[model samples]
Target: GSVVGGLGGYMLGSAMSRPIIHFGSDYEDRYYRENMHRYPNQVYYRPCDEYSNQNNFVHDCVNITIKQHTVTTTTKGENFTETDVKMMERVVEQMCITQYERCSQAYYQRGS
Candidate 1:
């Protein structure tokens, strides 16, 4: 089946990689320095209440799942093979090149 999700498909195992998360360009450098153990091969999760669905943690428990691939590999390596990489790259490129501006008054930030 053809999948059309950013990260949902991978979360459900219908695809290989999730939306490539970038906490800005420095993410990889931070992974190499401060969080090598937690890098590239961990599955980040935040515990949510089954009923309320609220998680107490400030930051999500970030992780990657493919352990046999080894910690030295980047998350990109763990999640995608070369053929998949090209497709994902196109997905990302299209997304990055697009943008939208909206009135701040139109949206409200929920204090979770």
Candidate 2:
């Protein structure tokens, strides 16, 4: 079966490395410090519901299914390997931390 996504026969632009998250957030700075674990060698996880403007304490969870030989792109088939997905996560983390660090400046307040 040939897949014609946004970029020709390549589905790269559709969802190459987008996390298959059943739950979501922008714990952008906080989640950045957390680690990743996979289901089949992934940071994949489905948890107990946690939400309160973000998350509460129980009964919910976040699902991060990003475990695979995600580094492969088929020669002429749909069985593509995904490497960028995992790397993207790390990249996002680093970018967030960098941006977060930028928030440490005293330029936002007038105490001095």
Candidate 3:
């Protein structure tokens, strides 16, 4: 009788406490939202001309591009010295910061 009672208890417990697994779509939704704006293939850099008159300059210009985390620069005219390069580098730095914020906002949106 004791063995039968033990078996009955085990069966009853197993039947009453069956696992109720809930496989939801939260993961799929979060992944889609987070990667909606992962990154761009390339970013265009706007030209800078604020330092056109500091040195002996005529048409100081700088063009830059970032493709897949690589940076490239192009310049035109004279007086494109270290100072001008530093100025352009600052602009690029700001651009990177702004871009990262925008990307983070998209990736980490509400519910994502």
Candidate 4:
């Protein structure tokens, strides 16, 4: 099924011109547990030298969000097969990774 039902284009290229990544509550929880320290919530008070050096630190951990969605239709009551599940899991992992990067960027940039 063409799940992108209404999405038409002067060019099919338009459909993919944007990059979308979907993160989940589950991945949020996991990312939270793993990257808690990297995602700071307050201004970092430190030596000027440290701050300068640290720009790159947060930059590296935070830049991951810049890395870069899908929809599908199917028969009713159908469940994912193992192959389907495997593919989706990979997609989910990418989503989680992107979100993790986004969080770190927000946390580090807003505060420090």
> How many residue pairs clash (N, CA or C atoms closer than 3 angstroms) in each of the candidate models, in the order given?
8, 22, 0, 0
Write one digit per residue (lDDT tens) for candidate 3, span 1-112.
Answer: 3443221110000011111222255663463344323212233322232223422211111123222122222332233345334433443344433444444464566544
lDDT of each: 0.30, 0.29, 0.31, 0.33
Error of 2 at 22 (Å): 30
User: What TM-score number comes out for model 2?
Assistant: 0.26
Mark the regions of model 4 whose C-alpha exceeds 4 Å error after superposition: 1-75
Please report, as a residue range, the 10-residue window in candidate 2 with the lowest summed lDDT: 7-16
lDDT of 4 by residue, 4-93 (tens): 444321111111111222345665446444433322222112222323344443343222221111122233334434543333443334
> Per-residue alpha-carbon lDDT of model 2 for 43-67, expressed as tens digits?
2211212113322111111112221
lDDT of 3 at 97: 39
TM-scores of the candidates in the order shown: 0.22, 0.26, 0.32, 0.33
- Candidate 1 structure, TM-score to reference: 0.22
Model 3: number of clashes?
Answer: 0
User: How does residue 111 of candidate 4 score in lDDT?
Assistant: 88
1 against 2, candidate with superior lDDT: 1
